[PDB]
């Protein structure tokens, strides 16, 4: 399920079965490596253009600020809102996707580059 | 044939079929002029206006419309935004007013020519109230749409000052009729006692996808304070397990009831259905009964009054009728057996709050009566069958006993072999030869299977509850 | 003929003008917060009352504030349920074991 994205000054990331809807009971991190005096750029490509009014459990897309569940926490996104670019010098991107039992959604799609 | 005019309004799709409460205002004067057990010299007739939905203004303005005809009494729209109008201009000219939807009650008005068959919510609720400690539950939980549901659930909403229960409160999204958000927090929640509030075609709508969401266990005990529930096509669900309870005003046991329900529907089901929506196609809904029998409740009264005229009311011509100060009396004084039996007018407030309401449930054939209620005598429900249907205690002289297990590895496995079998022959170990030789040493008639938890049964120190096989046992 | 009203207190007095006015185009003032009826498409009026559907939100930062873990309201006629329901709906996520009384 998951995904080595290292050694790329750019790759593409996003869920599985990214057109369809995601897959449920899905637990894959997905780790960011960046070498050392390089600088973090997320990108993220959001495919539905709407405002959730609730911020609900279920399902949720960490990051963290270094090795994942171990580190700083960043914040925990949901809704269909595209979260706004991150920009950190951590050299570190650890990241999980989540699922629930039922109820999927249309998925996310990611894009990382690194200076 | 005494000539008289019944004022008419109806919020109206101004297109398609005919206005259901305005079918049925028809229907009830045409057996008012076919049937001389009532108005031997009398003959009804009629004007209709229609108006837009939610809109005081061209209401009043139709209302002195027909006011300028003169008409016995105004039987205002369905709701509030046009009803309060309609209200004091009713009272303003003297003129009584009918009305047939609970609305908001103003704090403090004054006035006193109108009533409102439909039974109150408070009473309602009290009856809820009554119902729900008959089941002792602890933890039920609401969902309204409208904010005017926690007007009509007050009641119960207080509820938490006296008895001991639990309640929270939670609002059906106003648009996207989508609950899967919401049912997934109940179901997470663990909420299996649920009440609603809503026009029953959302109770029919939001039933498909409690379905959909695998909600239809037999664990949750829905209620639906929505009164015709009896109109609902439960038919995928009466095999699932649960069970729904839903008050049912409009007496079905009357011969006479059903009659007018099938000829209702040779005229009403004259205009097609919707097959989507869950529903049994053409017939009675409450609010259609209602107007019915509203129409019967005004012809008592104007069948002692001859002395009724019709003055060419204009409402700019600001002095008040003559003979609705009597009038209104006589209605306040009816009593009456219709379509929903016992109708009757409390003096206090002039609206109706003594009412025989039927308890009915999802029983596994349909929907039965199963008990009967009222405000005064409290829950009277008919204890047949409870243990036995003679009455006397009574044991199944077979055995059909169950048992339950966990596969514990020396204890309970599941029988290993390639080929499968089934029954209570699947398992084997310690505890399988065990219950072997309770059946060979007492001849028993076992179940063997799982629980869901699977485990010892452990205490829920979350509500109290127990598990698994403590829970089972 | 005017440009302009300045309206009623009870509800009542209240919907009725302000469906007349939007009637005719004339534009509504109004002070007392009063019940919104969900479904009017009307256009022509205004509220200066500070709505509480913010008074309640804000109730709720207080209550958060002082940390209480019961409290019980205690409202005055029907209406008020309406004015607060906002804060009602609030054990759905957080634990505010309340009463009503
Ligand atoms: C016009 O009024 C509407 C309705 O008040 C405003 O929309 C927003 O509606 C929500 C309803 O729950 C209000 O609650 C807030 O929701 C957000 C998002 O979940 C949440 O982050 C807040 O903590 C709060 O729970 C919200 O206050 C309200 N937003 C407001 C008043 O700004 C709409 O935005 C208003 N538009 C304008 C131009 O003021
Ligand atoms: C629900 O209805 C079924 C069939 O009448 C009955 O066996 C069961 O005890 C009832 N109670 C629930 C909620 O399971
Ligand atoms: C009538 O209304 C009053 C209001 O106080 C209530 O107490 C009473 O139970 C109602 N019923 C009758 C028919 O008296
Ligand atoms: C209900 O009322 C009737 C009145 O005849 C009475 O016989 C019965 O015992 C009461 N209770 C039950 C069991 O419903």
Redesign the pocket.
């Known amino acids: 399920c998951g995904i080595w994205v290292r050694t790329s000054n750019g790759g593409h990331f996003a869920s599985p079965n990214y057109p369809d809807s995601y897959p449920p009971n899905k637990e894959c991190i997905y780790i960011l490596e960046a070498a050392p005096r390089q600088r973090i750029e997320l990108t993220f490509d959001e495919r539905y253009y709407i405002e959730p009014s609730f911020e609900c459990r279920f399902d949720h897309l960490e990051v963290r600020d270094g090795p994942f569940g171990f580190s700083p926490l960043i914040d925990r996104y949901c809704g269909m809102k595209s979260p706004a670019l991150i920009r950190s010098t951590g050299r570190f991107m650890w990241i999980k996707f989540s699922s629930d039992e039922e109820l999927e959604g249309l998925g996310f799609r990611a894009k990382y580059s690194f200076i | 044939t005494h000539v008289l005019r019944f004022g008419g309004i109806f919020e109206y799709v101004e297109s398609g079929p005919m206005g259901a409460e305005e079918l049925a205002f028809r229907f009830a004067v045409n057996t008012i002029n076919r049937n001389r057990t009532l108005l031997p010299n009398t003959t009804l007739t009629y004007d209709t206006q229609k108006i837009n939905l939610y809109d005081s203004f061209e209401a009043s303005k139709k209302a002195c419309d027909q006011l300028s005809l003169g008409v016995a009494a105004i039987l205002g729209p369905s709701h509030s935004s046009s009803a309060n109008a309609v209200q004091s201009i009713c009272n303003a000219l003297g003129v009584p007013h009918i009305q047939t939807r609970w609305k908001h009650q103003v704090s403090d008005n004054k006035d006193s020519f109108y009533v409102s068959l439909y039974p109150d919510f408070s009473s309602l609720s009290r009856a809820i109230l009554d119902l729900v400690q008959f089941f002792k539950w602890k933890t039920v939980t609401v969902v309204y749409d409208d904010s005017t549901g926690l007007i009509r659930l007050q009641e119960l909403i207080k509820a938490p000052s006296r008895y001991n229960l639990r309640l929270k409160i939670r609002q059906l999204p106003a648009d996207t009729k989508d609950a899967k958000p919401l049912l997934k927090e109940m179901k997470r929640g663990k909420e299996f006692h649920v009440i609603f509030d809503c026009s029953h075609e959302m109770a029919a709508g939001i039933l498909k996808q409690a379905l959909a969401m695998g909600m239809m266990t037999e664990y949750y005990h829905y209620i639906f304070t929505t009164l015709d529930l009896f109109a609902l096509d439960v038919e995928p669900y009466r095999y699932s397990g649960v069970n729904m309870t839903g008050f049912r005003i409009l007496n079905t046991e009357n011969t006479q009831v059903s009659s007018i329900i099938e000829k209702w529907s040779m005229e009403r089901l004259q205009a097609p259905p919707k097959p989507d929506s869950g529903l049994l196609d053409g017939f009675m809904t409450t609010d259609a009964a209602l107007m019915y029998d509203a129409v019967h409740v005004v012809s008592v009264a104007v069948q002692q009054f001859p002395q009724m005229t019709v003055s060419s009311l204009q409402c700019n011509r600001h002095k008040p009728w003559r003979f609705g100060t009597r009038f209104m009396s006589l209605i306040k004084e009816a009593h009456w057996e219709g379509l929903t039996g016992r109708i009757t007018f409390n003096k206090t407030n002039g609206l109706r709050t003594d009412f025989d309401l039927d308890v009915i449930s999802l029983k596994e054939e349909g929907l039965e009566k199963i ?2 209620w009222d405000p005064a ?1 409290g829950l ?4 047949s069958q409870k243990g036995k249907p003679a009455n006397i205690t009574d044991s199944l002289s077979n055995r059909s006993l169950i048992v339950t297990t966990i596969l514990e590895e020396p204890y309970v496995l599941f029988k290993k072999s390639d080929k499968p079998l089934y029954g209570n022959d699947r398992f084997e170990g310690y505890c399988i030869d065990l219950l072997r030789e309770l059946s060979t040493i007492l001849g028993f008639t076992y179940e063997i299977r799982l629980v869901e938890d699977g485990k010892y049964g452990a205490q829920d120190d979350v509500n109290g509850q127990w598990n698994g096989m403590v829970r089972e046992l």
């Open positions: 008990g009967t005598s009277n429900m008919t204890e």
